[PDB]
């Protein structure tokens, strides 16, 4: 049925001439180097395996891949065609081509590719031959393709590279603060051969109309579209089976009289799908088969795991004085508080993304996040990531691949984007974890705040984010809410002016200074979808990613002066030399908190990690603590996609920073947290479950050992409760909160006082706490 | 670098058959009269110089040009191709073709023209040959081209001629109260040959973000787009120089790492640009060059005179009793009173417009006008007109070349109009005198007041004025206000009814 073309290919690369090569004769006549290639894979990996490129993850070797951005790649292989009977179709499927390519089978052009993100399918039934057949893909330079378009004023000067605007690729591949500039090329996803019967299932869409969690009942609809010859009309029946493990719940057989039908299923004894903490992620195996009525032949079969859930978004785009707006997620008729992480690319070389999926999903399970926001600068994740999210009950907020920039309003861009959006929506609409579609990341912020700020442009007139994607979602997925842009500058916002006070949801970056500044504590946004603080990686990562002489951050021993490699790893997209920049954020924060920047490397690492951990823990507690007004916090990020110095709490090679352990003790389902008050500190308990729990909480000072508070608490379901108010303690110190719920003991801590602190005293307090 | 094809051409004209001639063999086989022609020029001027047409400016001689509106015009010339090295491009540029034509170089078609108001550029690098080369342009009748379209009820009965609606020409050429009916045809603007290096500047947009007149400071942005071979990446630097007279004010050098960049310039000792009476029209010479880092070769250079000014329009759509509206121009943060004249075509034979520009602009200097409104029935003026307005501090209010009628809502017209609008906006966006873009002239007035008045049509549903044109300005020129129609019948006006009392701005005839 399916034959995989993955394995060993032949790769020939040559510099791209003035007129790009688009034929097999031109590719064969060009002068280039021939090396063995592995599919799926990137050309950089294949070049490294041939001893032509040094490891780009060490030092300044990333800048030595610049000359290869103007090369042309020619992949070739010989395959044996499967035996195809009369009426069957042979389909060549490429999971991903990067980016512009012309596919040729037996010397005949079967199609062309111009989108990196979506899948490509070609019908090669007529062109195949008996015996060996030859497949050849000629890839052009993506950087030089951007010069074929005229760019408007909106598309120049944004954070996203100008080369990214006219083409459809991942914006982060061109360079970002969090990711290196690795344009790359190649067949980064699987290539397979498929044989389809004349009767086949083009699409099956499972839609949950209603779910009654208490009665264990749900109503499901199946929209099935098939390819059906007329001679097979009324002679084919559709068998629909829903089962849990091996036990069967519902079986329905219906004769197929039309190519497209809608089947209504009323189920009983079915449990609803819940995110983490609010319930169990119940998944049921839904299978639809096309079976002949006379004989028993099965023409086609499609199987997937589905969950019964309803998602609604309460949106009021303006917080006016006295008129609070709203941004809250309603799952199964119950409001939920979202605590989770932004998901940035798992690797600069995207062909290695599939191997890192399980480890990163396990990281999010360990942190106990109930939501992930797929960043707009990343490619669309494959099916395995969404299957894991379904299994572990983590809701997914998906961004279309546009971010930090404005795009063309002309027809050619819209046609390409509509095709890509239709493909993605049909691909990813059956996963219960996916709850929201978002138009872009920070595109409205770029226009309102940026180089065109004084001209007061209106983001609501954007065609791309408000006419194309909205229409696609309206036609192909009406069951999910759609958000035009991540910082939503709606029509009502523009009437009263754009500012942080009128945004129910906003990204809080701004001045990355004392975490306890009024910019963060007094921000009125009910939902924050991007917030983070810089932190220095562990010593092992530093030694692995930096030359032996460059391990020490200081240049010539001068504190505060970064050497060339350290400056590169902050992320300089282009090889130019300057002092300061993004790296200065780490030293400024350390100086504000601990007074002085330590000269020793280990002490500097400890100080930076402690500052990041304290800032991140303080931010999550402030939002969870101030509920019911606050409705969610999606922080930045849980893992880095390249060895770099960044805001991630875990690095590329799995090393966990101190922020990971601190933030783990503030993501618990029932958490006792201390928040600042006008006089003293106030102890509170937050519940993100649907149940009631009771327990004993004790608070004592780490240094003196005096017990500040001790009592019993009762936590109501899905609410933040007030326990007691603690008297203000004198000077600087740590209070250790220890709570036992249902025979399990959990611990947390609070740092009281005012900066600057003493690093030795802070280390002593942390060691005496013993929780880290 | 540039070679001019202007001069003496050969013109053959013949009546257009039932099937219009579109090939060189058909044009040469037709029976016609051969006369010498001068480019730039109109066919009527060339015919007059041959003693075939009486002077149309005297008496009723204008009506004797009617039979020539159904003729076909074939212009021909032989040119010597410049020497072109490897990687260089040879570009054929026509400043204006009137109107529908098929251009053929050495017997090979290189393109087609269907817009009189915009420039046409063709790449003829491959088709040229050593020695003499032949250029031939075959022009078809503009009047008979209007019969290939089906007209809606909106496009019939308006003051503008029905033949003007489907095609893209100057509406006044078909007849107006102020202008004679003289359709004419020909190459009315310059024809030139350009040689471009592989590294060249496609566009340089100077934008003034802020200006502080008192501190003599301003912030300027340069959006540069270039053609850059990959082998030349990081080996080309952009040299930006801003100077007044010979004195240099700012010089910035930046390495070119991508084809499109945005450069931010913070200037001091720079004076703001003011209209007449409110100050001095200070102009500074802004030049950008692409220079190789290793050697000193200069691949390309663009030079222009720019002024530092900010323009805002305070607009309130409706004048209500007790709630007055607003229609005011704010220049450099100050409200200004605009007194000036509408600019109507300088000549019916548009190839003579360039000679009248200097004399006509001096009229507005003597009158001391501080604003000119370019009428919608006229062609778009050339660069020289706007340079004079910059020098003398006269603000320009430009109308898109549609007026006194309603146009098609279908896709074919929208695509043609969008192509024209982009070309015009990119051409004229760097002139400090240009302060406002207007959608049309009296198009809302024609629909509301006219043959379809009793049916109470809503002008706010017009596709051309409020969707196609506003989107082009939104993308290619966000620094200038846009007015959907010259008499603006906004959504608020239609709610309370369309009357002279509720219009903050109106035409009073």
Q: Which residue has the tokens 């001391």?
A: B368
Residue B442 backbone phi and psi in degrees, to 5: 60, 40
Q: Is A558 on the interface with B (CB under 8 A)?
A: no
Please state, in angstroms and rounded to a whole number, the distance separating the CA atoms of residues B104 and B137: 6
The two three-digit tokens of residue A48, written as one number? 């490294």
Contact (CB<8Å) B471/A452: no
Q: Exposed, middle or buried, B377 (CB in 10 Å: 0-12/13-18/19+)? A: buried
Instruction: Report residue A128 CA to chain centroid gap.
Output: 39
Q: Which residue has the tokens 């342009």?
A: B137
Instruction: Report residue B344 CA to chain centroid gap.
Output: 15
Residue A335 backbone phi and psi in degrees, to 5: -65, 140
Q: What's A70's DSSP letter?
A: G
Residue A305's nearest CA partner among A211, A200, A239, A390 is A390
Cα dist from A222 to A204, A205, A264, B93, B427, whole Å: 7, 6, 7, 60, 55
Q: Is B409 on the interface with A (CB under 8 A)?
A: no
Instruction: Report residue A665 CA to chain centroid gap.
Output: 23
Cα dist from A353 to A341, A357, A359, whole Å: 18, 7, 11
Instruction: Tell me the chain B residues in contact with residue A154 when contact means C-beta distances shorter than 8 Å.
Output: 475, 478
The two three-digit tokens of residue B362, written as one number? 């001096």
Terminal-residue alpha carbon distance, chain B: 51
C-beta neighbour count of A732 within 10 angstroms: 17
Please state, in angstroms and rounded to a whole number, the distance separating the CA atoms of residues A252 and A267: 11
Please state, in angstroms and rounded to a whole number, the distance separating the CA atoms of residues A715 and A724: 13
Q: Is B254 on the interface with A (CB under 8 A)?
A: no
In DSSP terms, B102 is beta-bridged to B112, B138
Q: What's B343's DSSP letter?
A: E
Please state, in angstroms and rounded to a whole number, the distance separating the CA atoms of residues A185 and A101: 10
Terminal-residue alpha carbon distance, chain A: 54
Q: Which residue from B87, B202, B203 is facing A18, i.e. has the nearest CB?
A: B87
Residues in chain A: 772
Residues 617 through 636 of chain A touching chain B, CB cutoff 8 Å: none
> Do the beta carbons of residue B302 and residue B287 sit within 8 Å?
yes
Q: What's A375's DSSP letter?
A: -
Nearest CA in chain B to A69: B230
Q: Which residue from B230, B261, B475 is facing A154, i.e. has the nearest CB?
A: B475
Please state, in angstroms and rounded to a whole number, the distance separating the CA atoms of residues B371 and B348: 23
> Do the beta carbons of residue B430 and residue B414 sit within 8 Å?
no
- Maximum pairwise Cα distance, chain A: 87
The two three-digit tokens of residue B135, written as one number? 């250029």
> Do the beta carbons of residue A339 and residue A371 sit within 8 Å?
yes
Q: What is the DSSP string of A390-434?
A: HHHT-EEEEEPS-BSS----SHHHHHHHHHHHHHHHHHHTT-TTE
Q: Is B384 on the interface with A (CB under 8 A)?
A: no
The two three-digit tokens of residue B311, written as one number? 């323009």
> Do the beta carbons of residue A336 and residue A330 sit within 8 Å?
yes
The two three-digit tokens of residue A165, written as one number? 């605007």
- From start to end of B59-159, where are the E strands? 71-80, 89-94, 97-98, 101-105, 108-113, 120-123, 132-139
Residue A3's nearest CA partner among A191, A181, A145 is A191
Please state, in angstroms and rounded to a whole number, the distance separating the CA atoms of residues A185 and A140: 9
Please state, in angstroms and rounded to a whole number, the distance separating the CA atoms of residues B443 and B439: 9
Please state, in angstroms and rounded to a whole number, the distance separating the CA atoms of residues A631 and A504: 10
Cα dist from B245 to B249, B253, B276, B282, whole Å: 10, 21, 21, 11
Please state, in angstroms and rounded to a whole number, the distance separating the CA atoms of residues B118 and B95: 7
CB pairs under 8 A between A and B: 75
Helix (H, G, I), strand (E, B) or coil at A77: strand
Nearest CA in chain B to A150: B225
> Do the beta carbons of residue B264 and residue B423 sit within 8 Å?
no
> Do the beta carbons of residue B88 and residue B99 sit within 8 Å?
no
> Do the beta carbons of residue A746 and residue A739 sit within 8 Å?
yes
In DSSP terms, A498 is beta-bridged to none
Q: Encode burial over A38-66: b for 16+ CB neighbours within 10 A, e otherwise.
A: bbbbbbbbbbeeeeebeebbebbebeebb
In DSSP terms, B91 is beta-bridged to B123, B194
For residue B452, say if its preceding peptide bond is cis, omega within 30 degrees of 0. Answer: no
Please state, in angstroms and rounded to a whole number, the distance separating the CA atoms of residues A364 and A383: 17
Q: Is B358 on the interface with A (CB under 8 A)?
A: no
Residue B299's nearest CA partner among B203, B381, B196 is B196
- Orientation angle between helical segments B383-392 and B353-367, nearest 10 degrees: 20
The two three-digit tokens of residue A424, written as one number? 């993605």
Q: Which residue from A144, A153, A576 is facing B230, i.e. has the nearest CB?
A: A144
Please state, in angstroms and rounded to a whole number, the distance separating the CA atoms of residues A684 and A675: 7
Q: Is A597 on the interface with B (CB under 8 A)?
A: no
Please state, in angstroms and rounded to a whole number, the distance separating the CA atoms of residues B299 and B228: 11
> Do the beta carbons of residue A274 and residue A329 sit within 8 Å?
no
Instruction: Tell me the chain B residues in contact with residue A162 when contact means C-beta distances shorter than 8 Å.
Output: 258-261
Q: Which residue has the tokens 């790492």?
A: B257
Instruction: Tell me the chain B residues in contact with residue A16 when contact means C-beta distances shorter than 8 Å.
Output: 230
Q: What's A579's DSSP letter?
A: S
Q: Is A141 on the interface with B (CB under 8 A)?
A: yes
Q: What's B323's DSSP letter?
A: B
Q: Which residue from B227, B234, B418 is facing A147, i.e. has the nearest CB?
A: B227
Please state, in angstroms and rounded to a whole number, the distance separating the CA atoms of residues A726 and A729: 9
Please state, in angstroms and rounded to a whole number, the distance separating the CA atoms of residues A354 and B253: 44
C-beta neighbour count of A209 within 10 angstroms: 14
Q: Is B262 on the interface with A (CB under 8 A)?
A: yes
Contact (CB<8Å) B231/A150: no
Residue A180's nearest CA partner among A347, A67, A404, A41 is A347
Helix (H, G, I), strand (E, B) or coil at A308: coil
Q: Which residue from A151, A451, A452 is facing B225, i.e. has the nearest CB?
A: A151
Please state, in angstroms and rounded to a whole number, the distance separating the CA atoms of residues A371 and A424: 20
Cα dist from A686 to A189, A650, A675, A738, whole Å: 43, 26, 12, 15
Nearest CA in chain A to B474: A457
Q: Which residue from B198, B202, B262 is facing A451, i.e. has the nearest CB?
A: B262
**Which residues, other chains included, contact B42 with Cβ-Cβ below 8 Å and sequence gap of 6+?**
B98, B184, B185, B186, B188, B349, B350, B351, B352
Helix (H, G, I), strand (E, B) or coil at A97: coil
Resolution value in angstroms: 2.6
Q: Which residue has the tokens 């082998």?
A: B231
Residue A18 backbone phi and psi in degrees, to 5: -60, -40
Characterize the bridge pairing of strands A120-123 and A89-94: antiparallel
Contact (CB<8Å) A451/B221: yes
> Do the beta carbons of residue B273 and residue B309 sit within 8 Å?
yes
Q: Is A145 on the interface with B (CB under 8 A)?
A: no
Helix ranges (H only) for A12-116 are 24-29, 43-49
Nearest CA in chain A to B230: A70
Q: Is B481 on the interface with A (CB under 8 A)?
A: no
Instruction: Tell me the chain A residues in contact with residue B479 when contact means C-beta distances shorter than 8 Å.
Output: 455
Residue A391 backbone phi and psi in degrees, to 5: -65, -40
Please state, in angstroms and rounded to a whole number, the distance separating the CA atoms of residues A423 and A420: 5
Q: Is A160 on the interface with B (CB under 8 A)?
A: no
Cα dist from B412 to A415, B160, B463, whole Å: 17, 20, 12
Can you give the three-state secondary structure of B409-465, one letter per residue?
CCHHHHHHHHHHHHHHHHHHCCCCCEEEEECCECHHHHHHCCCCHHHCCCHHHCHHH
Nearest CA in chain A to B254: A576
Helix ranges (H only) for A265-410 are 353-367, 383-392
The two three-digit tokens of residue B272, written as one number? 């703001």
Q: Is A451 on the interface with B (CB under 8 A)?
A: yes
Q: Which residue from A151, A153, A409 is facing B471, i.e. has the nearest CB?
A: A409
Instruction: Tell me the chain B residues in contact with residue A463 when contact means C-beta distances shorter than 8 Å.
Output: 471
The two three-digit tokens of residue A105, written as one number? 């089978």
Contact (CB<8Å) A69/B198: no
- From start to end of A106-255, where are the E strands? 108-113, 120-123, 132-139, 191-196, 200-212, 217-227, 236-244, 247-255
C-beta neighbour count of B333 within 10 angstroms: 12
């Amino acid at each position: 049925s399916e034959q995989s073309l993955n394995g060993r290919w032949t790769l020939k690369f040559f510099p791209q001439p003035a007129v790009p090569v688009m034929t097999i004769e031109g590719a064969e006549a060009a002068n280039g180097i021939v090396v063995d290639a592995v599919v799926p894979g990137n050309v950089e990996i294949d070049m490294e395996a041939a001893g032509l490129v040094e490891d780009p993850m060490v030092g300044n070797n990333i800048y030595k891949l610049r000359p290869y951005e103007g090369y042309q790649w020619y992949y070739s292989r010989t395959f044996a065609a499967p035996v195809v009977t009369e009426g069957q179709r042979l389909v060549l499927h490429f999971g991903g081509i990067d980016t512009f390519a012309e596919v040729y089978v037996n010397g005949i052009k079967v199609g062309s590719a111009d989108n990196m993100l979506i899948e490509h399918d070609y019908d090669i039934t007529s062109v195949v031959k008996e015996g060996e057949n030859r497949l050849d893909v000629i890839i052009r330079s993506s950087v030089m393709e951007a010069q074929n378009h005229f760019l408007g004023t909106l598309s120049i000067g944004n954070f996203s590279n100008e080369e990214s605007a006219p083409v459809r690729r991942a914006p982060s591949t061109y360079g970002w603060d969090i990711m290196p500039r690795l344009v790359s090329a190649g067949l980064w996803r699987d290539v397979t051969l498929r044989v389809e019967n004349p009767v086949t299932i083009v699409d099956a869409n499972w839609v949950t109309l209603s779910v009654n969690p208490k009665a264990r009942e749900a109503s499901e609809s199946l929209y099935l579209q098939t390819r059906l010859p007329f001679e097979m009309h009324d002679k084919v029946k559709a068998v629909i089976t829903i089962s849990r493990d091996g036990r069967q719940i519902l079986r329905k057989e219906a004769l197929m009289r039309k190519f497209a039908n809608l089947f209504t299923l009323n189920l009983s004894g079915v449990d609803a799908w819940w995110p983490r903490g609010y319930g169990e992620p119940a998944l049921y195996t839904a299978e639809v088969s096309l079976v002949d009525v006379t004989s028993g032949k099965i023409y086609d079969t499609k199987t997937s795991k589905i969950g019964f859930r309803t998602v609604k978004l309460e949106l009021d785009e303006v917080n006016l004085p006295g008129q609070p707006g709203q941004f809250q997620f309603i799952i199964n008729g119950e409001p939920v508080f979202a605590k989770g992480t932004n998901w940035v690319p798992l690797d600069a070389l995207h062909s290695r993304d599939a191997s890192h999926v399980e480890e990163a999903v396990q990281l999010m399970v360990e942190m106990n996040c109930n939501i992930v926001r797929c960043w707009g600068g990343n490619v669309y994740e494959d099916t395995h990531f969404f299957e894991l999210c379904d299994k572990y009950g983590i809701m997914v907020w998906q961004d279309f691949a546009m971010g930090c920039g404005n795009y063309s309003q002309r027809d050619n861009f819209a046609a390409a984007l509509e095709k890509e959006a239709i493909s993605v929506v049909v691909k990813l609409r059956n996963h219960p974890s996916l709850i929201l579609w978002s138009g872009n990341n920070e595109d409205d912020q770029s226009l309102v705040f940026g180089r065109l700020a004084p001209f007061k442009a209106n983001p609501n007139n954007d065609r791309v984010s408000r006419q194309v994607l909205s229409r696609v979602i309206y036609e192909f997925d009406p069951t999910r809410p759609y958000l035009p842009s991540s910082p939503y500058y709606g029509p009502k916002v523009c009437e009263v002016g754009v500012r942080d006070e009128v945004l129910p949801e906003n990204h809080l970056w701004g001045p990355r200074g004392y975490y306890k500044d009024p910019f963060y504590t007094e921000n009125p946004s009910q939902f924050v979808s991007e917030i983070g603080y810089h932190g220095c990686p562990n010593r092992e990562t530093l030694e692995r990613m930096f030359s032996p002489d460059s391990v020490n951050p200081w240049q010539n021993g001068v504190v505060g002066m970064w050497n060339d490699e350290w400056q590169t790893k902050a992320n300089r997209i282009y090889d130019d030399k300057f002092q300061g920049g993004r790296n200065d954020l780490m030293t400024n924060q350390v100086r504000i908190i601990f007074g002085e920047v330590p000269a020793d490397l280990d002490d500097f690492i400890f100080a930076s990690q402690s500052v990041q951990a304290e800032a991140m823990k303080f931010f999550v507690e402030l939002w969870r603590g101030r509920r019911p007004y606050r409705t969610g916090i999606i922080w930045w990020n849980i893992r880095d996609g390249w060895p770099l110095l960044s805001d991630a709490i875990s690095d590329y090679w799995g090393g966990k920073k101190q922020a990971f352990y601190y933030m783990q003790n503030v993501h618990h389902d029932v958490c006792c947290l201390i928040n600042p008050a006008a006089n003293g500190y106030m102890l509170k308990v937050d519940n993100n479950t649907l149940k009631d729990f009771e327990g004993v909480v004790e608070v004592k000072d780490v240094a003196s050992g005096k017990q500040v508070f001790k009592g019993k608490f009762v936590s109501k379901a899905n609410q933040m409760s007030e326990i007691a108010t603690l008297p203000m303690q004198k000077g600087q110190g740590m209070l250790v909160i220890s709570y036992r719920i249902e025979g399990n003991e959990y611990f947390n801590h609070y740092l009281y006082g005012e900066p600057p602190y003493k690093l030795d005293q802070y280390r002593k307090w942390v060691k005496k706490c013993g929780i880290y």
